[PDB]
């Protein structure tokens, strides 16, 4: 359930 | 030579306190624009961006851009040796192999001089693109901190629901559950294009509130399925901005 | 339905802080006349009895009588999310208790909600006591903390003149004498031994009143009583060491 | 019988607070001239020396000289039951098997009496001149030692005409603090020759627990000999600490 | 030596 | 090694 910040950079 | 004098040295103290507990190391981009720091925590769940503009300093010198690799834990223990009224100076030769901090007690009869090694850290500038947000909430930073501390006694995650008339914070745990509702109008100002509802790790939110001493107000910008922004203005210097990927 | 609204919600906060470190779970008797609680610690050495009169709340409603089973750890924790200036309301719709915290600015409201339990009441009949001592709360608290650094037990000795608290241990002995705001109503001199470990749990009640009353009679439990202004009382009872 | 009444009880409270964390037992020499305590820490790196002159006490009786072997852990715990404004009386019969501490609540009709067994339990640092004597605020000296101990274990103290400098270095990095000459917040050097010594910050930080006894501290030093850290106890005497150097 | 408050309960 | 004892400074 916890997404990483990496997707959005 | 890079050299930056800050009469209100406590800002640095409060910035290192806001960062040491979330990131261990971080690269400091030194340029004519001033200081820029971008850095994910070790688990890549959150992002910290600090800007301290060179006009916010009282003496700013930069012969050459520098990528200062800083052990924030070392810089934090050093900054804990400065008094709250001290005049702090950061200085690095153009080699950039050590960083110097100088605390001039204002009486001028006391002057400390600390020094730490810099490490090679590459600037992975990879960043969050500026964008509109569906709900931007401006509110007292102390209240946001109490909301987060409160709720984390209930559960691990908070549900932030934001409308035009109000924003709600909710957590469920084994104990029971709680909801905290804020209405509009220091004070609370909500700018909504669309209603959002997002889930977040209170664990990480409570790291961010360690920044509360930098400003009396925090802004939360959020859209659907993207990270939340918690922004603290560092008056007349820039901001410290935390980003937190959501739970889905 | 049951709905009690309390303007000074800090009372609840102080009431539960004083309870949570002695007893984990207890039963809340709700009637027309307010809230009664009566509960022993897990080792049956002490007993707590709290009275919250119904006319002590701002609004008070009670359709039927309820014996609410409450986890006081959980209720404490929730109550920590109440500010000292919040208007606290409790609500139970005849197995869930709600708590509502209304902030002064009227633009922040907190709802908390907690599952209640099924819990299975004797009590200590009131007597005439040989000695009864009214003293400042802070002083009796300080005397207990002090003396627990010398020994585990405190001999309380009461005369018409004054009251003497004594403990001895491996690292020496100590005596704290008080005279006669301190008021003694002796009808017979007493001398008793109690556990300091237990009295210091009781003194978590200290912020509820600037005064405490100790009631002593030979071979019977001590009563350490805190009057909650215009609401009732928190009463502690502690068996003697003989 | 020995019996000393101290109206300013807080002094004994602070004095014991400042000894308990460095030494566990010590001998109290009770004499006609007063109270004298002179003890080494368990590892013989420091020596503490307390003097409370008899005239410092509100009343002072001492019929014979006494070596009262004292458990400072027991004593400290007892003194913690004293209020900061209590009148403290010490009492010992001449047999010296136990020590009585009486605390008179200033106004309140409350009187506390504690009692403590004594134990059966003198070489010193000779008086000397010191190349450097720094008089400086106690609080400042405390912050310096606390701060510098986050950087390293040792401090190099350097005293000159201009000022006094404290510096440490760890793996983290190095630091140094320079004081300069400027009361009570005044910094004052009486130097005779420049001095540079190295001392253990762990011990200094035990010494600074005496900071409540005086807003001033005196550092005295000469080459290859122990530093002296002195807190005057006003109208009473002093509490002195000697710290052997690191060579 | 520690009595329980059971027994004083009525 | 370098920490001197206070003993040798007493008399």
Q: What is the DSSP string of C169-206?
A: -SS-EEEEEEE---EE--SS-EEEEEEHHHHHHHGGGG
CA distance D80 to C149: 9
Nearest to C146 among D81, D115, D116 (CB): D81
Identify residues of E whose CB sits under 8 angstroms from chain C CBs. Answer: 1-6, 8-10
CA distance B227 to B49: 14
Q: Do chains F and D touch (3 or more CB pairs under 8 A)?
A: yes
CA dihedral D167, D169, D175, D178 (to 10 degrees): 10
Nearest to C122 among E1, E4, E9 (CB): E9
The alpha carbon of residue B161 is apart from the nearest alpha carbon of chain C, in Å, by 14
What number of residues does chain E have? 10
The alpha carbon of residue B104 is apart from the nearest alpha carbon of chain D, in Å, by 10
Q: B244, A3: Cβ pair inside 8 Å?
A: no
Q: Do chains A and C touch (3 or more CB pairs under 8 A)?
A: no
Q: D147, B81: Cβ pair inside 8 Å?
A: yes
Q: E4, C239: Cβ pair inside 8 Å?
A: yes
**Which distant-in-sequence residues (6+ apart) come within 8 Å of D246 by Cβ?**
D154, D198, D199, D200, F2, F3, F4
Q: Which two tokens stand for residue D11?
A: 């002094």
Chain B contact set for D180 (CB, 8 A)? 108-110
Kindly report each contact of residues C56-59 with a partner whose C-beta sits within 8 Å and lies 24 or more positions away, as own/partner.
C56/C228, C56/C230, C56/C231, C56/C232, C57/C4, C57/C5, C57/C6, C58/C5, C58/C6, C58/C7, C58/C87, C59/C3, C59/C4, C59/C5
CA distance D22 to D48: 9
CA distance D110 to D91: 19
Chains that touch E (3 or more CB pairs under 8 A): C
CB B78 within 8 Å of CB B114 = yes
In sequence order, the β-bridge partners of residue C28 are C37, C68
With CA atoms as reference, the chain A residue closest to B204 would be A2
Residue D162's domain comprises 1-247
**Residue of B175, B181, B183, B188 to mutate for C, most C C-beta atoms under 10 A:** B175
H or E element, residue C75? helix C72-80
Count of structural domains, chain C: 1
Edge-to-edge, what's the strand order for the sheet holding B157-162?
Answer: B196-201, B157-162, B167-172, B176-182, C108-115, C96-102, C87-92, C2-6, C59-62
The alpha carbon of residue B245 is apart from the nearest alpha carbon of chain C, in Å, by 26
Identify residues of B whose CB sits under 8 angstroms from chain D CBs. Answer: 74, 77-78, 80-81, 83, 98, 108-117
For D206, what's the count of Cα atoms within 13 Å in the CB-facing half-sphere?
20
Distances in Å between the Cα of B197 and the Cα atoms of B169, B170, C108, C110, D185 are 10, 11, 19, 18, 57
How would you classify the pairing of strands D132-137 and D216-221? Answer: antiparallel
Q: What are phi and psi of D197, to 5 degrees?
A: -130, 165
Q: C157-193: b or e for each residue (b if 16 or more CB lie within 10 Å)?
A: bbeeebbbbbbbbebbbbbbbbebebebbbeeebebe
Q: C115-127: b or e for each residue (b if 16 or more CB lie within 10 Å)?
A: ebeeeeeeebeee
Chain C contact set for D111 (CB, 8 A)? 176-177
CA distance D39 to D53: 18
How many contacts (CB atoms, under 8 Å) link B and D? 51
Q: Which two tokens stand for residue D12?
A: 């004994």
How many contacts (CB atoms, under 8 Å) link B and C? 50
Please state whether C188 falls in left (phi above 0), alpha (psi between -120 and 50) or beta: beta
Q: B77, D182: Cβ pair inside 8 Å?
A: no
Chain B contact set for C81 (CB, 8 A)? 150-151, 153-154, 178
Nearest to D150 among B77, B98, B113 (CB): B77
CA distance B74 to D176: 15
Q: B77, D179: Cβ pair inside 8 Å?
A: no
Distances in Å between the Cα of D180 and the Cα atoms of B111, C73, D10, D160, D177 are 9, 56, 33, 10, 10
**Residue of B45, B130, B207, B230 to mutate for A, most A C-beta atoms under 10 A:** B45
DSSP conformation class of C236:
E
With CA atoms as reference, the chain B residue closest to A8 would be B128
Chains that touch F (3 or more CB pairs under 8 A): D
Please state whether B14 falls in left (phi above 0), alpha (psi between -120 and 50) or beta: alpha
Cα four-point dihedral sign C78, C79, C85, C89: positive
Nearest to B176 among C83, C108, C115 (CB): C115
CA distance D228 to D219: 6
Edge-to-edge, what's the strand order for the sheet holding D227-233?
Answer: D66-71, D25-31, D34-40, D46-53, D237-243, D227-233, D216-221, D132-137, D188-191
CA distance C221 to C219: 7
Chain F contact set for D198 (CB, 8 A)? 2
With CA atoms as reference, the chain C residue closest to E10 would be C122
DSSP conformation class of D56:
G
**Residue of C136, C176, C182 to mutate for D, most D C-beta atoms under 10 A:** C176
**Residue for token digits 């201009």?**
D162
Nearest to D115 among C146, C172, C176 (CB): C172
Q: What are phi and psi of C176, to 5 degrees?
A: -120, 115
The alpha carbon of residue B203 is apart from the nearest alpha carbon of chain D, in Å, by 28
Q: Which two tokens stand for residue D45?
A: 């790196």
Cα four-point dihedral sign D178, D182, D183, D185: negative
Q: B128, A7: Cβ pair inside 8 Å?
A: no
Chain E contact set for C240 (CB, 8 A)? 3
The alpha carbon of residue D213 is apart from the nearest alpha carbon of chain C, in Å, by 23
Q: What count of other Cβ atoms lies within 10 Å of the Cβ of residue B130? A: 5
**Which distant-in-sequence residues (6+ apart) come within 8 Å of B242 by Cβ?**
B46, B47, B48, B49, B207, B208, B211, B229, B230, B231
Q: Do chains D and C touch (3 or more CB pairs under 8 A)?
A: yes
Nearest to C111 among B146, B178, B182 (CB): B178
**Residue for token digits 């008089």?**
D135
H or E element, residue D110? strand D110-117
Q: C44, E2: Cβ pair inside 8 Å?
A: no
Identify residues of D whose CB sits under 8 angstroms from chain B CBs. Answer: 140, 143, 147-148, 150-151, 163, 172-182, 187
CA distance D1 to B155: 65
Burial of D184 (0-12, 13-18, 19+ CB in 10 A): exposed
CB B52 within 8 Å of CB B77 = no
**Which distant-in-sequence residues (6+ apart) come within 8 Å of B107 by Cβ?**
none
Largest CA distance in chain F: 24
SS3 track for chain B: CEEEEECCCHHHHHHHHHHCCCCCEEEEEEECCEEEEEEECCCCCEEEEEEEEHHHCCEEEECCCEEEEEEHHHHHHHHCCCCCCCEEEEEECCCCCEEEEEEECCCCCEEEEEEEECEECCCCCCCCCCCCCCEEEEEEHHHHHHHHHHHHCCCCEEEEEECCCCEEEEEECCCEEEEEEECCCCCCEEEECCCEEEEEEHHHHHHHHHHHHHCCEEEEEECCCCCEEEEEEECCCEEEEEEECCEC
Burial of D113 (0-12, 13-18, 19+ CB in 10 A): middle
Chain C contact set for D74 (CB, 8 A)? 171-172
Q: D71, C176: Cβ pair inside 8 Å?
A: no
CATH code of the domain covering residue C4? 3.70.10.10
Q: Which is nearest to B49 in space by CA: B233, B174, B246, B247? A: B233
């Amino acid at each position: 359930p916890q997404k990483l910040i990496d997707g959005f950079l | 030579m890079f050299e930056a004098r800050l009469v209100q040295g406590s800002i640095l103290k409060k910035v290192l306190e806001a960062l040491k507990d979330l990131i261990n190391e971080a690269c400091w981009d030194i340029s004519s624009s001033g200081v820029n720091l971008q850095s994910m925590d070790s688990s890549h769940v959150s992002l910290v961006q600090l800007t301290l503009r060179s006009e916010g300093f009282d003496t700013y010198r930069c012969d050459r851009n520098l990528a200062m690799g800083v052990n924030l834990t070392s810089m934090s223990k050093i900054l804990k040796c400065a008094g709250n009224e001290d005049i702090i100076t950061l200085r690095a030769e153009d080699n950039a192999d050590t960083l110097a901090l100088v605390f001039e007690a204002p009486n001028q009869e006391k002057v400390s001089d600390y020094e730490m090694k810099l490490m090679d850290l590459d600037v992975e500038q990879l960043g969050i693109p500026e964008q509109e947000y569906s709900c931007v909430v401006k509110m007292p930073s102390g209240e946001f901190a109490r909301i987060c501390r409160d709720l984390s006694h209930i559960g691990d995650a908070v549900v932030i629901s934001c409308a035009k008339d109000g924003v709600k914070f909710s957590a469920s745990g084994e104990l029971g559950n709680g909801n905290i509702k804020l209405s509009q109008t220091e004070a609370v100002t909500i700018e909504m294009n669309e209603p959002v509802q997002l889930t977040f790790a209170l664990r990480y939110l409570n790291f961010f509130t360690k920044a509360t001493p930098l400003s009396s107000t925090v802004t939360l910008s959020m859209s659907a399925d993207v990270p939340l922004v918690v922004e603290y203005k560092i008056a007349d210097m820039g901001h410290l901005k935390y980003y937190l990927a959501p739970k889905i």
